[PDB]
Amino acid sequence: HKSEVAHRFKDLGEENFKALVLIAFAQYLQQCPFEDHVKLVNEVTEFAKTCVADESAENCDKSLHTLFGDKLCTVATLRETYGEMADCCAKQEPERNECFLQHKDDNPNLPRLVRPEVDVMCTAFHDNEETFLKKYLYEIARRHPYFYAPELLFFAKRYKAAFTECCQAADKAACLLPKLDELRDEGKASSAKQRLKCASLQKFGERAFKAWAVARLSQRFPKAEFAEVSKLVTDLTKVHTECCHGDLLECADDRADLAKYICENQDSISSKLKECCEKPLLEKSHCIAEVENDEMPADLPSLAADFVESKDVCKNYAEAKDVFLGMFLYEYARRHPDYSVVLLLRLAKTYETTLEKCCAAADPHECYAKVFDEFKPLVEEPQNLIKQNCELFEQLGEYKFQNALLVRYTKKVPQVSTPTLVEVSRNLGKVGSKCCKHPEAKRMPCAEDYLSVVLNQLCVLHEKTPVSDRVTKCCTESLVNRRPCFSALEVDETYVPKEFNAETFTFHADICTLSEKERQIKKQTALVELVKHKPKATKEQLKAVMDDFAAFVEKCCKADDKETCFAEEGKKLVAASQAALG
Ligand SMILES: CCCCCCCCCCCCCC(=O)OC[C@H]1COP(=S)([S-])O1
Ligand SMILES: CCCCCCCCCCCCCC(=O)OC[C@H]1COP(=S)([S-])O1
Ligand SMILES: CCCCCCCCCCCCCC(=O)OC[C@H]1COP(=S)([S-])O1
Secondary structure, three states, X not given: OOOHHHHHHHHHHHHHHHXXXXXXXXXXXXXXXXXXXXXXXXXXXXXXXXXXXXXXXXXXXXXXXXXXXXXXXXXXXXXXXXXXXXXHOOOXXXXXXXXXXXXXXXXXXXXXXXXXXHHHHHHHHHHOHHHHHHHHHHHHHHHOOOOOHHHHHHHHHHHHHHHHHHOOOOOHHHHHHHHHHHHHHHHHHHHHHHHHHHHHHHHHOHHHHHHHHHHHHHHHOXXXXXXXXXXXXXXXXXXXXXXXXXXXXXXXXXXXXXXXXXXXXXXXHOHHHHHXXXXXXXXXXXXXXXXXXXXXXXXXXXXXXXHHHOOOHHHHHHHOHHHHHHHHHHHHHHHOOOOOHHHHHHHHHHHHHHHHHHOOOOOHHHXXXXXXXXXXXXXXXXXXXXXXXXXXXXXXXXXXXXXXXXXXXXXXXXXXXXXXXXXXXXXXXXXXXXXHOOOXXXXXXXXXXXXXXXXHHHHHHHHHOOOOHHHHHHHHOOOOXXXXXXXXXXXXXXXXXXXXXXXXXXXXXXXXXXXXXXHHHHHHHHHHHHHHHOOOOOHXXXXXXXXXXXXXXXXXXXXXXXXXXXXXXXXXXXXXXXXXXX
8 A cells, every 4th residue: 555646546547547536626626627627637647657657756655635635735726716625725634635525515606518519529529539528527527526436437438438329320410319318317317316315314314224225235135145235234334424424535445345345245145246346446336336136036935924923023123123124124125126115115114113013012913913914005106106107108208298297296386486397397207208118117116216316306406495395395204205295295275376477478480490308398388387377277278278389389380481470379379378268
């Protein structure tokens, strides 16, 4: 452990070094221009080469935290642009690093990234691949300062990948846009996931974390023994506390350590891990984290014998409540890779509650004999909601399913601003489209994965700008209750129709030719506004107005005077619609 900077440089290679160093700096020095970072990354890459050459070269023996910090404190911008972050520079490691970390801006205040036009991207990528890509890595990293830098990097490669394939196809646009689309969505899910995982530990607590991890691991590693699973829970629990409450390097090593452990112990954990364990170490923690579930062992006993029929049920649980509960979780989850983790947690909490009651009562065995019956309707409630929505998704297709949702949710919580309802409803559609393509057995974990981030960003947004007690309630509920709390929102009976504003419902020739996304958003925006303005309109009535709007758009995009048609036919569409909805 002589020269840490050389150790990493060799561990990572030059390409990954420079990328990670670029990200690391963009994440802390979020306002600085790209070229300033690129100079900081050269300076640091040049400097690191020496340490690979001569470990006893100067400064090469310094810790990474020290090097990184020294480097941050050299930037001329520091006090002017980052205020008190400059003050971290008067402190010594380890409090200097700690200080640098407390001052990172959760939400930078920056314009969004304009997806440029496909010509422009493919030309930049041809003309100057390095700068194109890295500039986008900086832009994303500065906008996502907590995003675990090696997770960013893995995205970048997929981007690059898409550009290689797509920048040389006939119809570049249609090779690439769906790839950019999926990647954008995945990238957001992924950053949102990480915010959720660190928030949820503070919020829901450590017992819940462990309960989540147990469930999750056990589905993935169903051949593993409770002992091995428990061990993994504990290290993963540590690992998450370091990645959430600590900095990059603590986390990377904590992660390489768990990965290393896992790869040494594969036969005790999973037969599915060999591809991952022969990845370069950087990718190794990631590949593991995304591995398929190992096959269940065959002929697994029913859980009745250990958890219901045994007369030691109350004794074994009392001896150690959490251990028995976790073993419950382990057994239930390894058998059910088809459940969301969170459903598995509802199940275990129902069991726990059932045991706290029954173990005190006159005849404990009799009282908890019906506990597995308590499970059926917990399991079947999300299996039925998936089925209903995926049937509907099939019928309507993504866009009209998003429109069905908008109406549903606008009537639920009509106080939510219109863009948020649009985004959220577009995102829920994207989730449907994603998860409904999986078979029934993979629907629930999928849904849990994306919904959990959709719903948590909704709650992060709404916390900032509360407009509903009902949304607050769902956002502050327990882990197991949040989603069912959302599913139980009803139509808001007390809401006062929004006032009519004719401009809102005016439309132009442009709507005929805008990009698909753009065109949808404008229509969906207006649909939200319509439900806000006419919240007691029936489905039949809203379909009538949407059928008219449809006919209006189709006519005015076939007209030769489009500008005139849109102002005149649209005047009349409005008038008709106002009379129709009283
Ligand atoms: C402001 C509007 C926000 C709307 C959010 C409403 C709740 C989302 C309902 C989505 C329907 C999809 C099916 C479904 O909910 O099941 C998902 C599984 C995954 O975790 P669980 S709680 S076991 O349920
Ligand atoms: C996944 C990569 C590493 C392997 C397992 C890591 C364990 C993750 C630790 C706990 C994460 C908790 C996040 C959470 O509480 O999710 C909220 C869910 C439950 O209902 P919904 S609203 S669908 O969202
Ligand atoms: C009563 C106040 C005035 C309201 C007049 C409102 C008419 C327009 C309302 C927004 C448009 C409804 C949303 C809608 O267009 O979606 C339906 C589908 C039908 O085919 P497309 S044109 S691809 O869009």
